[PDB]
Amino acid sequence: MKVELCSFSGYKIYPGHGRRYARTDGKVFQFLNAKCESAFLSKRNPRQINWTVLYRRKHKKGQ
Amino acid sequence: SGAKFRISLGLPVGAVINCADNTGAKNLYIISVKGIKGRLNRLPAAGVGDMVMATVKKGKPELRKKVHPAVVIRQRKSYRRKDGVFLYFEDNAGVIVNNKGEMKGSAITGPVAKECADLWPRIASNAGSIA
Amino acid sequence: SHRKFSAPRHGSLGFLPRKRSSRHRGKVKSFPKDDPSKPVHLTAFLGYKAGMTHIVREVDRPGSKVNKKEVVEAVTIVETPPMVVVGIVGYVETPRGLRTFKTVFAEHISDECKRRFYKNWHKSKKKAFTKYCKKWQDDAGKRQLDKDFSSMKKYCQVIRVLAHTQMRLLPLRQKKAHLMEIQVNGGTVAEKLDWARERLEQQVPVSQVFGQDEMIDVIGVTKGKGYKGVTSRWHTKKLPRKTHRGLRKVACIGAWHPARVAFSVARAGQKGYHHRTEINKKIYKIGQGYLIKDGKLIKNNASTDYDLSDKSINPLGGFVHYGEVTNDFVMLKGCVVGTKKRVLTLRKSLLVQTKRRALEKIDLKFIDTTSKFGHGRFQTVEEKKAFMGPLKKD
Amino acid sequence: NEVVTREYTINIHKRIHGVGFKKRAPRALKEIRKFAMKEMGTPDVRIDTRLNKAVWAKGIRNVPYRIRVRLSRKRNEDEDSPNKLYTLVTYVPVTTFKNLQTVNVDE
RNA sequence: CCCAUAUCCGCAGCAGGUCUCCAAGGUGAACAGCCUCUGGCAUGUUGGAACAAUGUAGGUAAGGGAAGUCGGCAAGCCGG
RNA sequence: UGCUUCUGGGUCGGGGUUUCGUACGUAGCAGAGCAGCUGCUGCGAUCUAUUGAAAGUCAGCCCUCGACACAAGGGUUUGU
Ligand SMILES: [Mg+2]
Ligand SMILES: [Mg+2]
Ligand SMILES: [Mg+2]
Ligand SMILES: [Mg+2]
Ligand SMILES: [Mg+2]
Ligand SMILES: [Mg+2]
Ligand SMILES: [Mg+2]
Ligand SMILES: [Mg+2]
Ligand SMILES: [Mg+2]
Ligand SMILES: [Mg+2]
Ligand SMILES: [Mg+2]
Ligand SMILES: [Mg+2]
Numbered sequence: 045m046k047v048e049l050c051s052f053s054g055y056k057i058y059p060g061h062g063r064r065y066a067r068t069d070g071k072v073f074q075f076l077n078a079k080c081e082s083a084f085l086s087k088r089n090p091r092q093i094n095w096t097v098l099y100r101r102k103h104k105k106g107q
Numbered sequence: 108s109g110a111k112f113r114i115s116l117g118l119p120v121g122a123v124i125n126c127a128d129n130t131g132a133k134n135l136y137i138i139s140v141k142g143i144k145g146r147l148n149r150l151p152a153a154g155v156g157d158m159v160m161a162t163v164k165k166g167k168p169e170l171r172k173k174v175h176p177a178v179v180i181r182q183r184k185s186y187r188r189k190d191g192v193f194l195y196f197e198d199n200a201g202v203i204v205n206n207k208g209e210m211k212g213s214a215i216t217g218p219v220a221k222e223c224a225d226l227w228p229r230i231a232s233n234a235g236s237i238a
Numbered sequence: 239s240h241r242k243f244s245a246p247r248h249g250s251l252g253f254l255p256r257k258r259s260s261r262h263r264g265k266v267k268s269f270p271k272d273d274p275s276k277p278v279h280l281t282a283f284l285g286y287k288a289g290m291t292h293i294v295r296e297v298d299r300p301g302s303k304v305n306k307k308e309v310v311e312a313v314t315i316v317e318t319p320p321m322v323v324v325g326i327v328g329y330v331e332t333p334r335g336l337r338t339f340k341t342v343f344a345e346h347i348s349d350e351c352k353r354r355f356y357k358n359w360h361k362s363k364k365k366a367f368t369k370y371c372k373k374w375q376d377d378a379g380k381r382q383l384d385k386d387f388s389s390m391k392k393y394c395q396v397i398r399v400l401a402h403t404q405m406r407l408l409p410l411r412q413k414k415a416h417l418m419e420i421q422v423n424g425g426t427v428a429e430k431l432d433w434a435r436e437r438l439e440q441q442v443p444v445s446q447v448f449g450q451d452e453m454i455d456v457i458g459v460t461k462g463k464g465y466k467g468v469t470s471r472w473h474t475k476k477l478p479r480k481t482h483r484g485l486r487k488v489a490c491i492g493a494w495h496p497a498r499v500a501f502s503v504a505r506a507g508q509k510g511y512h513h514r515t516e517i518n519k520k521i522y523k524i525g526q527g528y529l530i531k532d533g534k535l536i537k538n539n540a541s542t543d544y545d546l547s548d549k550s551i552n553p554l555g556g557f558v559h560y561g562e563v564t565n566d567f568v569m570l571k572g573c574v575v576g577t578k579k580r581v582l583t584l585r586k587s588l589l590v591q592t593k594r595r596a597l598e599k600i601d602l603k604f605i606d607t608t609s610k611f612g613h614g615r616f617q618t619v620e621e622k623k624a625f626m627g628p629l630k631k632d
Numbered sequence: 633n634e635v636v637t638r639e640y641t642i643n644i645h646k647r648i649h650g651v652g653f654k655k656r657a658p659r660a661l662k663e664i665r666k667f668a669m670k671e672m673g674t675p676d677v678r679i680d681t682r683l684n685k686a687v688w689a690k691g692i693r694n695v696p697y698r699i700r701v702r703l704s705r706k707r708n709e710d711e712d713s714p715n716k717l718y719t720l721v722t723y724v725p726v727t728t729f730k731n732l733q734t735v736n737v738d739e
Numbered sequence: 740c741c742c743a744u745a746u747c748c749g750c751a752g753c754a755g756g757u758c759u760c761c762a763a764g765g766u767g768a769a770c771a772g773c774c775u776c777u778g779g780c781a782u783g784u785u786g787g788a789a790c791a792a793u794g795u796a797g798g799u800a801a802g803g804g805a806a807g808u809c810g811g812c813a814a815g816c817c818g819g
Numbered sequence: 820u821g822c823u824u825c826u827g828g829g830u831c832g833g834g835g836u837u838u839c840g841u842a843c844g845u846a847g848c849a850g851a852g853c854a855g856c857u858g859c860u861g862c863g864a865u866c867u868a869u870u871g872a873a874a875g876u877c878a879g880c881c882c883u884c885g886a887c888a889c890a891a892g893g894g895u896u897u898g899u
Binding site: 648672 | 829830831875876878885887888889
């Protein structure tokens with residue numbers, strides 16, 4: 045079974061969990077929960093939010 | 108062969124969905140759903156893939172003030188799929204149709220849910236995307 | 239006059255006396271009819287509702303739109319450690335019913351089952367069967383026992399067996415076991431009886447009773463909800479906003495001249511804690527308990543042919559409000575009745591399952607062991623550590 | 633053995649969870665007085681006014697989540713009453729409740 | 740001496756009624772609303788434990804948006 | 820439903836989980852700038868590092884076998 049990846053956070057979405065948003069111009073996004081989905085719909089930037097994956101990647105944290 | 112599964116219908120009778128094809132119609136006032144028996148004090152309710160009777164409220168005047176068939180191609184309410192997904196679109200939209208299924212228009216602006224493509228071939232042909 | 243528009247009745251009259259159930263453990267009101275052809279077996283068991291989770295299996299049903307397409311589908315775990323047989327009981331068919339003719343108990347009985355007798359195990363002297371036990375170790379008693387066996391063989395028609403649970407093998411709080419008469423179905427009474435006689439004081443795992451993809455019934459007490467009004471009890475209409483004496487009522491409870499109020503009118507009262515039988519639940523999987531061997535224990539129950547991991551069904555943080563399933567368990571399709579930590583009675587089906595949906599074989603691809611104590615996003619603690627990396631607490 | 637004292641800590645956040653606003657600090661005092669009644673089998677309990685003020689430190693709606701306390705069992709003073717030993721409850725200011733065990737403090 | 744949610748009139752220590760004087764800080768246009776100091780009080784003829792229904796008074800609701808109803812009553816939107 | 824099989828539950832602590840989103844302090848030749856003193860030193864919303872940090876988490880979540888105390892008891896009745 046294909047495991048998707050949250051379009052906002054970057055975590056792994058398992059078969060049962062999350063949702064999908066289909067915008068009027070294609071561009072389907074997968075979401076892990078209504079925290080990601082709401083930070084997306086609010087038009088937040090995943091790179092300025094400490095817990096996302098694009099943040100840890102930008103600031104090179106971890107390793 | 109394959110039969111339409113049930114989805115979380117979310118378009119009561121009175122919904123004004125936008126008209127996602129190039130027939131010059133801008134709206135679709137849903138006036139009743141096809142295939143609904145009913146119940147005391149229970150509005151009919153259409154979902155993705157359900158044929159309905161609608162009415163163009165704004166658009167070309169040769170389409171207004173009359174009843175039309177239509178098919179809901181995108182609903183905003185989150186419906187579940189048997190494969191364990193919950194999908195929903197950015198807007199409600201449907202296309203106009205004749206009683207045998209052929210689209211009155213030519214193109215479809217935007218996606219078309221696979222619950223509507225598996226079911227209406229002449230809408231999947233004029234489709235732009237799927238799901 | 240007549241009702242203007244037709245509406246069907248609100249709620250069923252077939253479950254009518256909606257009262258608090260008079261028993262906590264579900265009662266097999268009827269066992270499957272026995273044929274002397276089938277070999278000797280049992281007809282019911284006893285498990286405890288752990289929790290629910292997803293399942294990704296490949297669907298095989300030619301003609302359906304999901305043929306050979308993975309579908310996510312909820313299941314329910316019922317932890318079922320093996321039952322201990324502690325006595326047999328025979329019945330005679332009389333023109334007044336089915337009278338119980340004789341009961342016989344085994345020599346030794348656990349303190350688990352002996353707790354079921356006393357309403358207070360703390361103030362008691364624990365004397366149950368203390369004089370009965372001295373029948374299994376002397377000719378004066380052994381003779382009488384063999385008599386009481388050749389009698390049940392001569393007369394009894396139905397043979398049931400008494401089998402209690404093992405309550406120490408569970409993560410619950412109560413130590414007092416649950417007893418139950420499981421009817422032995424099979425051959426002639428002589429062979430049905432010299433079977434249970436061998437199994438006195440023995441353990442019966444679920445493999446001996448239920449298989450896989452086997453449709454069964456679940457008998458148990460609905461989860462209780464208290465003194466609920468008529469809108470919650472019978473799901474009647476809610477009156478409009480301008481109603482003076484409250485709006486979550488039934489406006490008319492009867493005509494004039496039927497000068498009572500009838501038994502089919504929706505009225506407020508107890509809701510939940512009823513006794514329900516829910517039929518046609520498919521056994522997706524009879525998992526296996528933990529076990530030590532070569533010092534290392536094997537816990538991987540939720541690993542499938544496709545997953546190939548080392549995770550048990552236990553979600554991250556254990557099942558909520560229940561604990562850790564470390565025993566055998568069955569995986570039933572879909573919800574079952576009751577609440578968590580509730581003893582369900584799993585009964586063999588009373589019908590002849592001849593249907594593609596009943597005879598479908600099951601092959602799970604993936605079992606979901608994320609946490610249920612919130613929107614958990616990690617299957618295993620290993621996968622979580624290997625994703626988050628090292629934290630500050632290290 | 634009969635006159636003993638020892639420090640505890642009381643997770644008020646769980647002994648109070650659920651009660652309404654205007655009755656939290658009160659239920660927290662009734663639950664301190666009952667806690668000391670359990671840990672020391674004396675019906676006479678006596679809550680110091682510093683522990684009172686420390687429970688009502690924030691307000692009536694926001695009682696501290698834990699609290700470090702010093703239960704001291706004492707001989708009944710004048711007016712020998714049906715009780716022979718009473719339990720004085722005393723506050724203990726603490727900067728963190730991490731790895732704080734029940735300590736058997738002595739004189 | 741009281742001059743009013745207990746000294747007056749309403750049968751009463753009655754949520755009603757009954758004529759005036761003085762009039763701080765912050766916010767703000769403001770004697771508006773909200774917090775505070777001087778001064779006053781102990782919740783308005785009782786407490787404890789529970790947290791069912793039905794109420795009373797506030798709230799929030801996916802999708803739809805008056806299809807409800809005699810009627811957009813009520814609520815909501817708007818607000819400087 | 821539990822209430823001495825050196826055990827048993829209870830409180831506290833610890834671990835798992837999980838929710839929100841990176842604590843106080845300190846460091847900074849990061850900061851629109853401004854001022855004083857002849858580069859230095861101050862004011863300065865915000866930023867970065869320490870920091871997926873801090874905080875909470877069963878009262879109706881899961882595991883402890885970590886400390887502490889406790890638990891062999893009380894009252895009323897019942898006979899073929
Ligand atoms: Mg009607
Ligand atoms: Mg009729
Ligand atoms: Mg009225
Ligand atoms: Mg949950
Ligand atoms: Mg009050
Ligand atoms: Mg008064
Ligand atoms: Mg009072
Ligand atoms: Mg709404
Ligand atoms: Mg909404
Ligand atoms: Mg109307
Ligand atoms: Mg009408
Ligand atoms: Mg109005």
